[PDB]
Amino acid sequence: SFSSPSGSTIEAGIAYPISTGFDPLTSSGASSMAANLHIFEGLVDLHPVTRQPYLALAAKEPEQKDDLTYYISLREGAMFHDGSPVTTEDVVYSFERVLDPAKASLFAQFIPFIASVTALDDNVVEFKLKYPFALFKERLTIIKIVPKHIVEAGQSAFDAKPIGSGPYKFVSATKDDRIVFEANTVYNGHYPAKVEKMTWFLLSDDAARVTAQESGRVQAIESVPYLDAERLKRKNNVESVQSFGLLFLMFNCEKAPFDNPKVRQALHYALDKQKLIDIVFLGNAKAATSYLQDTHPDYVKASSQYDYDKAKAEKLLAEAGITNLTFQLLATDHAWVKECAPLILESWNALSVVKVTLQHLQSGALYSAHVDKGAYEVVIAPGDPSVFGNDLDLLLSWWYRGDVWPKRRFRWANTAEYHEVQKLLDEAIKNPAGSKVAWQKAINIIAEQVPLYPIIHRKLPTAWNTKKLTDFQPLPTTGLSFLGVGRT
Template sequence: MFRKNKLGEMILAVTLILCITVTGCSTGGKTSTSNKEIKTSYNPGPEPKTLTPQMSNTIPEMIIEMALFEGLTRLDMNNVPQPAIAEKIDVSADALKYTFHLRDSKFSNGDPLTAEDFKFSWMYAMDPVNAAEYAYQIADYIKGGAAYNAKTGKAEDVGIKVIDPKILEVTLENPTPYFLALTAFPTYFPVDRKVVEANQDWNLKTETFVSNGPFKMISWAHNDKIVVVKNDNYWDAKSVKITELTFNLIEDTKAALTAYEAGQVDGVDSVPADDIQRLLKSGDLKVAPQLGTYFYAFNVTKKPFDMPEVRQALTLAIDRKKIIDTVAQTNEKPAFALTPNGINDADPRKQFRDVGGDYFTEDLAKAKQLLSEAGFPDGKGFPEIKILFNSNPNNEKIATIIQDMWSKNLGIQAALRQEEGKVYIESLHKHDYDVARVWWNGDYLDPMTFLDIFKTGGGNNVTGWANQQYDTLISNAKENTDPQARMQQLHDAEKILMTEMPVMPIYYPNLVYTSKVYVKDVIHSPLGMVDFKTATVEK
């Protein structure tokens, strides 16, 4: 498997932190046969804006991509990256060079999957012409990648080398303990170079959609459902039991739950707040740890949100416990910092969040003082805030509660602005909003997954905030091989973020979903992913 080196223990320590919830683990009762049709369905959320792995950045998209594609590694049920398309991985003694030996595998159309396809896919993600929001997820780690993405370097200088069709050599900018976990992330998934170069719209139609994962697409009724079936060209097809998997694309969580309770869908990824207690009592609702933070983003490019005092005042003037008790309702923790629990510090016996502690407390008197110092005593003269959120009754409930708190506590009026998923994402990235709801799930088990998104100009930095000292700390932490010093740099960076407050942390969500009891062995990751590779149905 992985060749041991002096950083081997650190690599394993980073990837062994969180367990993964497995829906209805099979007890070995009923089993399937290769000739038996086994069908199930799941509602991950709204219509994806894209299913090109290099261009996607939302959990619903990535849940679907997890079924259709596979990277060099795949996370197992203990959240540890295991060889997938790569059957062997060699790591140099200095942990800078990774050599991936690819197994014999094919795309769903029968084309052989080669090292060249991986290089093409990763370069596509980093190509500044494509403006991939997750470009940094590759570019910041691979030697020469950041320069190429910033148009200050050449493609030929990027540290991705095809040794032969079965060997991919990757040189990193700095040792990265979680790099193997990154290679299991959708941005690193391969696409078929031959198909993409022949048809730039390959991903828009079922008949031209090609993938390499456990399943292949057979139909896509936009804004309705995507149907995938077992991919017989998948290298590990023998482990895939589901013969047909339907992804319903119902954005309205109430409608999705209605479909679930009517037996039209076997699982949903989110439920309305009004139904949580009832579903908990019935046993339909599953609750597990999640590595995520629910927060509001401030558009700092727009007055008066360019003033730290305003952002701080709004942040200190809400009651997080009321929001949790009214909407979330599954013992979530209030967030007084960005990075959630579930990630170890340099000392693996301690959590990063516990070491960093809280960076602020709710304080109405201080909030009023800050607002007055900003020139808006008792909210006088403050423009109406429009709170942007994607269509979801829970998001609307939270926005309504915060709207009321800001009015009563600060004299600031707010209006609600609800948009469907794709339009909402566009508004965020165009900075077309005042204050917006954001839910960020970690992509890997390191504080960097929450903190590097706020680097100046970052693809997922929707706030417009920039701070040179913060950028330097993040860059230095990516270069630092001393675990203690590196974690301190990340703590220092988070302190700057939470002092200037381009974001308002609200709470740390739990993983909450429904699943029929007869659906077994679906892996629900704390990272938000749902893996159906080894799932089955036992009725």
């Protein structure tokens, strides 16, 4: 639990390129958000491994003054990396810019219950919320605290050279090359740097990445290729961590016959999930038994299940009165989706009254020219909003709240089941004491109606050298965390 940084360095192999800058307002790329876990802090952060809240820039737990105003006090002594002090003006600014529609940041959608954020004094910030909201503490992690005097001297420059208060400071970042960190010696939070320098090499090529681990070039690598996991097990820990990240089956619920729940259920029953897991993922996935993956703390198995069953799939199609079902399955370009989609196709074409064809597409082209234009019937695509949070409201709302997905994408919002889901989401966050029952009820509606519903949840394989690193834990998301990790 104590490790001296001096003398120690960490080299890691990351799989995803740099694709966004490092400003927490706009940084949504996997490598950038993982970097920012080390560079920035929220008032409360979510542990990257366990996803539980911990005090970061807050000095103590939120003072919920009444049901609707929270007081938060800043950690005394906290400074940004250029030496200046983290002030309550920076806190207010960080929330205001994310909340400012002009800046069109992605992260504004996670905190819409917040009416105002104002500095009470030099140490205490006040949050006034529109409606009561019992997951308030959990959402603070999405808003990294940025130094306003540095940001407004040039937002694009800040983006390329981020200054935060986290335990690691940004040194440099080169596309397709490396990201370099160094310890923040004036950090006085709970996860101090245990090494003095840290380098993430971008190793997009799978063979190069495994080679880097095998040779001892890096001590840890993300996104281990499935087949190489066992050769790496001779000298390294290799762990496949259950992720919320999933492959979903989405239906245009306003196109006949996919407006019929029984047709949607039948296409689930027709898929041999066990065989897709074996062939495609070499075991590194699990069939959905709920909206959540089964290792989620809130997981409860859904009352509708879709275990492989061709004869039930045929019966429901006859029950739906289907004589001939001819349609096109859209799939994205991802290499593992290109292995899935053919298996899914031949499963559906094995049905007597069903004929399907596949059009593999890019992602912006699958959404723009097809899904947004309503010009589609069935879409299999990946998604993982757990990178932004772990709570049931965030995970359910991402796909089943607002007009983004249920109105304009899978067109299920004119239905009576939808209105009940909305009623239940709203009522889950009014007060925690009905939260789990309402969330599980909405999941049971979703799993029965199956407008957008996971097929499998992926396991994410990470490899690391336990002889070289201390307390390293793999992530149930994309990325790598070295918070609390040191060298032997």
